[PDB]
């Protein structure tokens, strides 16, 4: 919805946004929103996401699709009305994104997802990009478990010429919906083939916001499918624009830079990662 | 589906993926998946592939088309539900790719298809590419024979101005689907007219993963029509990204370089091939 | 169809392909496929070709258009199934190209269509290109006459601002279909207005293979319509690609080079032609 501010209320917002990344307990936003999703009375649409055609499919809290949902509306604080209707497995009325309130006045945050190696990491969308054979796949997985911490991370696989990878975009949005409904730390390998369809355009535009709203982190390998030229900036500015955080390889072996948006209008942070390979191409991020 | 990992189960996956290439018996994954396909219940749709329009046609285990199929849903381990329905010869519900699970938890592999001249070769898609008219046709044939070994290889012909060559994309994808259903080693000559329709974009995106999942190898001649300029990266990298392996001509006559993706996040291997022509342009790949 | 090979059967294939060009009596493949066409039942579709919209029109063995044809299916040796149906003048089911099997196991040939001046010429598509008033029109007619030998050659006219030229693409494909069904040596003047519609894109992909399968030669004048700055590189390379043979002008007046693909995987031959004009711009190819 829209929000109104004066100097005082705006100072409060910013303080609250600063706190959401800097001082709230890591993973707390996800547990909260998990609570909100659990208390949703079953059958209620919770999430809508674009398929390849530009239409949207709709999910309930248990990540099952909704085929049929008759018009229901809700009135917000700002006087606006949200409506949801699902017909023949497609959204007839509504919008893309979360269809129940996970934030609730607190908007423009990058909720802290995890802490590792003396650094806090934001929820939202993390794009891992860089020079060909940068070691992107090993890096998303290392980031996956590191930020998972005590929890397992979910791996969504897409569009690579390896065994068991889905290459159908609609199954892909279904995997991603399920991941974000059920898990705090999610890896996508990869976005190569998404980079276009309306679904693909919707996805890039929608996912960071959906993830941030949830307080989960989606760690997505990108990669320009052509050129080791200065195309390492087009997708890396499509990266810069649609990502909460950016992880880029450097000229130094095994070294990466992490750039994080810490919230709305707040300062962007930078830190470095050192990494090395063990057996079977398992990568470790160095910490202590 | 999506898969959940912690450090320990990930290390087991990488061990398992490494083995699928490096220590499994060659052609063993193909025999296994032949066994899975054999054991499906009669009439079960097994494979869907995009036709020119972007719709999908569906095949059973004996590479015969299915034209009508009442909606059947199956619930995967990750809570995902897969649905398949076919009407008037066209998929009405489902996805492109394999419609039964060939892989399970074991995904992200490049299962060894064959061993020849002291080197292991991956299943999936191998694109053969190079300068102008570089001897691609003779090489895809020698490589088919060689990887076939005890078995005959299947030849799918498409889009060249020579006798008996199909030029209809929809007959092409029917040929490809049957080839992958029934044979471990498949040669495609050529992909030049594919490089786009919706079906053509789908084929390029799907075929490597379909082949890798089956344990079969598709050896495809490419070719840009025009330019020896830096279109020798435009069709390429469109190759190094859609392909499990690349075979590229060098500046030395008869010499080729093989670049192999051995698995998800695993090391890319390189080796060289020396070749010579015998009678009637039959190419031999040197070994010992 | 798809075809299976081992070393020995591939060796046989290449020998048969080599003989189809080098040792068969010239024009014998044309006479062979004529016999196959004469054997098909009355009313049966033999050939489908793309019209402007990308729909296909269908012809019978006597080059008459089929408007209605009840669904009939046919199962080839490889297990593949062809379904042909015509309805309201347009292919409801089937594929572009030959609808009956003209070639069998003998595929990937460039069947000798004629001999003239001590050179064998291939059936298929011969694109005549170069320069800009190199004398393309006189050359296609001289080549038509010479390859015709004892037979008259057929002239298909299209898209030139001269008396009696068809400029309608659907009449063009009707002319080309009839020509290939009835004559071994066909001249097309010219392809400038086809170089895009779906039909126009279908033609360039289809006709080399259609002609080679029949054992007829289509001698097509191409011509760039605009530019002369490395556009002669583009069309000479986009020609090299959809053509069985290329005839190219040189920097020497009246002189042309002929580049011939002699079959699948086989050696490409080159020879030169010297020519001169007599009365009324009638061109003679010098021989002996
Ligand atoms: N033991 C090891 N030592 C050094 N590098 C290794 C390694 N194991 C894997 N790698 C590197 O890690 C990469 C990970 O696999 P891939 O997914 O194939 C490439 P990527 O960097 O993710 O980019 P791309 O797939 O987007 O092109 C390999 O290409 C390889 O360069
Ligand atoms: N005995 C021999 N010695 C040397 N070269 C030979 C040969 N027999 C065949 N070739 C070459 O091998 C090629 C046969 O395959 P072709 O289909 O004609 C070209 P290609 O490299 O596959 O790419 P293209 O078809 O995309 O142009 C020809 O270029 C031919 O010159
Ligand atoms: N007596 C003569 N002496 C020399 N050249 C002659 C000639 N009579 C005709 N020509 C050549 O043949 C051409 C006639 O064919 P046109 O169709 O007019 C051009 P083209 O070379 O076929 O290419 P275009 O039609 O694709 O532009 C003339 O432009 C000229 O180059
Ligand atoms: Mn990768
Ligand atoms: Mn070739
Ligand atoms: Mn002309």
Q: Do A163 and B15 touch (CB under 8 A)?
A: no
Residues C87 and C157 in one domain: no
Q: Where are the alpha helices (DSSP H) in chain C?
A: 7-22, 28-38, 136-148, 169-182, 198-214, 231-242
Q: Does any ligand 2 atom lie closer than 6 A to the CB of residue B124? A: no
Q: Which two tokens stand for residue B16?
A: 């398992």
Residues C264 and C147 in one domain: yes
On whether the CB atoms of residues B264 and B108 are closer than 8 A, the answer is yes
Torsion angles phi and psi, residue A236, rounded to 5: -80, 0
Q: Taking the alpha carbons of C11, C15, C21, C24 in that order, is the dihedral positive or negative? A: negative
Count Cα neighbours of C156 within 13 Å in the Cβ-side half-sphere.
Answer: 27
Residues C5 and C33 in one domain: yes
Q: Does any ligand 2 atom lie closer than 6 A to the CB of residue C61? A: no
Domain with residue C93: its CATH number is: 2.30.270.20
Q: Domains in chain B: how many in total?
A: 2
Residues C36 and C63 in one domain: no
Torsion angles phi and psi, residue A95, rounded to 5: -135, 165
Strand ranges inside chain C, DSSP E: 3-5, 47-50, 56-59, 69-75, 81-87, 90-93, 97-98, 112-116, 119-122, 124-129, 154-157, 185-189, 217-221, 245-249, 255-261, 268-277, 283-285
Exposed e or buried b per residue across B232-267, where buried means at least 16 C-beta atoms within 10 angstroms of its C-beta = bbebbbbbbbbbbbbbbbeeeebebebbbbbbbbbe
Residues C150 and C222 in one domain: yes
DSSP A43: T
Q: How were these coordinates obtained?
A: X-ray
Atom of ligand 1 at shortest range from CA of B240: 27
Q: Which two tokens stand for residue B79?
A: 């809570």
For ligand 5, the distance from its centroid to the CA atom of residue C242, given in whole angstroms, is: 11
- Searching chain B, which residue's CA lies closest to the CA of residue C203? B167
3-state secondary structure at position A109 = strand
Residues B222 and B156 in one domain: yes
Residues C67 and C114 in one domain: no
User: Residue with the nearest Cα to atom 9 of ligand 3?
Assistant: C281
Strand ranges inside B103-158, DSSP E: 112-116, 119-122, 124-129, 153-157
Resolution to 1 decimal place, in Å: 2.3
Task: Using CA atoms of B190, B191, B194, B195 in order, give the dihedral in degrees to the nearest 10.
Answer: -140
Residue (of C92, C54, C63, C65) closest to C169 by Cα position: C54
Q: How many residues does chain B have?
A: 288
For a substitution probing ligand 1, which of A136, A191, A253 has the most ligand atoms within 8 Å of its CB? A136
Residue (of A275, A270, A271, A269) closest to A287 by Cα position: A275
Angle at B149 between CA B147 and CA B155, to 5 degrees: 60
β-partners of residue C136 are none
Give Cβ neighbours of residue A178 (< 8 Å, ≥ 6 apart). A59, A63, B2, B78, B79, B80
Domain with residue C237: its CATH number is: 3.40.50.300
Atom of ligand 2 at shortest range from CA of B140: 22
Q: How many residues does chain C have?
A: 288
Q: Which residues surround ligand 6, an ion (CB under 5 A)?
A: C 136-137
Torsion angles phi and psi, residue C132, rounded to 5: 140, 100
Tell me what percent of chain A is helix, strand and coil, each rounded to the nearest 5: 30, 30, 40
Residues A91 and A194 in one domain: no
Q: Could you give the CA distance from residue B211 to residue B203 in angstroms, rounded to a whole number? A: 11
- Searching chain B, which residue's CA lies closest to the CA of residue C210? B163
Q: How far is A276 from chain B (nearest CA, A)?
A: 13
Among B84, B103, B122, where does a domain finish?
B103
Residues C204 and C91 in one domain: no
Atom of ligand 1 at shortest range from CA of B261: 18
For ligand 2, the distance from its centroid to the CA atom of residue C271, given in whole angstroms, is: 17
DSSP B52: T
Q: How far is B190 from chain C (nearest CA, A)?
A: 11
Give Cβ neighbours of residue B234 (< 8 Å, ≥ 6 apart). A226, B224, B227
Residues C172 and C240 in one domain: yes
Report CA-CA distances (Å) from C282 to A74, C136, C138.
84, 12, 6
On whether the CB atoms of residues A194 and A200 are closer than 8 A, the answer is yes
Task: Using CA atoms of A258, A263, A267, A272 in order, give the dihedral in degrees to the nearest 10.
Answer: -10
Cβ-in-10-Å burial (0-12, 13-18, 19+) of A287 comes to exposed
* Closest CB from C80, C210, C215 relative to B178: C80
- Searching chain C, which residue's CA lies closest to the CA of residue B147? C6
Among A103, A127, A156, where does a domain finish?
A103
Residue (of A240, A102, A83) closest to A180 by Cα position: A102
Among B56, B81, B103, where does a domain finish?
B103
Which pairs count as long-range contacts for C246-252, CB under 8 Å and 24+ apart, including other chains? C246/C126, C246/C127, C246/C129, C247/C126, C247/C127, C247/C128, C247/C129, C247/C139, C247/C143, C247/C273, C248/C129, C248/C130, C249/C129, C249/C130, C249/C131, C249/C134, C249/C135, C249/C136, C250/C130
Give Cβ neighbours of residue C225 (< 8 Å, ≥ 6 apart). C192, C195
Report CA-CA distances (Å) from A227 to A66, B96, B231, B232, C26.
42, 29, 11, 11, 49
For a substitution probing ligand 2, which of B133, B220, B239 has the most ligand atoms within 8 Å of its CB? B133
Domain of residue C195 covers 1-41+104-288
Size of interface B-C (CB pairs under 8 A): 153
Task: Using CA atoms of B77, A185, A168, A83 in order, give the dihedral in degrees to the nearest 10.
Answer: 100
Residues C46 and C22 in one domain: no
Residues A37 and A139 in one domain: yes
Q: Which two tokens stand for residue B146?
A: 């060689």
Q: Could you give the CA distance from residue B239 to residue B182 in angstroms, rounded to a whole number? A: 25
Residue (of C133, C218, C222, C215) closest to C173 by Cα position: C218
Q: Could you give the CA distance from residue B74 to residue B237 in angstroms, rounded to a whole number? A: 37
């Amino acid at each position: 919805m829209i929000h109104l501010y004066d100097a005082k209320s705006f100072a409060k917002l910013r303080a609250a946004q600063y706190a959401a990344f800097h001082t709230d307990a890591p993973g707390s936003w996800f547990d909260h929103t998990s609570g909100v999703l659990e208390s949703v009375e079953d059958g209620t649409p919770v999430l809508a996401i674009g398929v390849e055609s530009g239409d949207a499919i709709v999910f309930d809290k248990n990540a099952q699709r909704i085929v049929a949902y008759k018009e229901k509306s809700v009135k917000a604080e700002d006087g606006s009305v949200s409506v949801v209707q699902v017909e023949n497995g497609f959204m007839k009325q509504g919008h893309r994104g979360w269809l129940v309130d996970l934030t609730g006045e607190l908007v423009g945050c990058s909720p802290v997802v995890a802490e590792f190696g003396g650094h806090r990491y934001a929820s939202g969308m993390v794009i891992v990009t860089g020079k060909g054979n940068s070691g992107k796949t090993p890096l998303v997985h290392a980031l996956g478990e590191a930020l998972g911490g005590k929890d397992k991370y979910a791996t969504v696989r897409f569009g690579e010429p390896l065994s068991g990878y889905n290459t159908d975009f609609n199954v892909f949005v279904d995997d991603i919906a399920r991941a974000m409904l059920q898990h705090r730390v999610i890896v996508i390998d990869s976005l190569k083939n998404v980079i276009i369809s309306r679904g693909a355009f919707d996805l890039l535009s929608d996912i960071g916001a959906m993830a941030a709203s949830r307080g989960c982190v989606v760690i997505a390998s990108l990669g320009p499918t052509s050129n080791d030229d200065k195309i390492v900036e087009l997708v890396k500015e499509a990266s810069r624009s649609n990502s909460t955080s950016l992880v880029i390889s450097t000229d130094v072996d095994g070294e990466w830079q992490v750039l994080t948006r810490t919230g709305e209008g707040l300062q962007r942070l930078t830190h470095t990662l050192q990494t090395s390979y063990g057996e079977h191409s398992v990568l470790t991020i160095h910490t202590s």
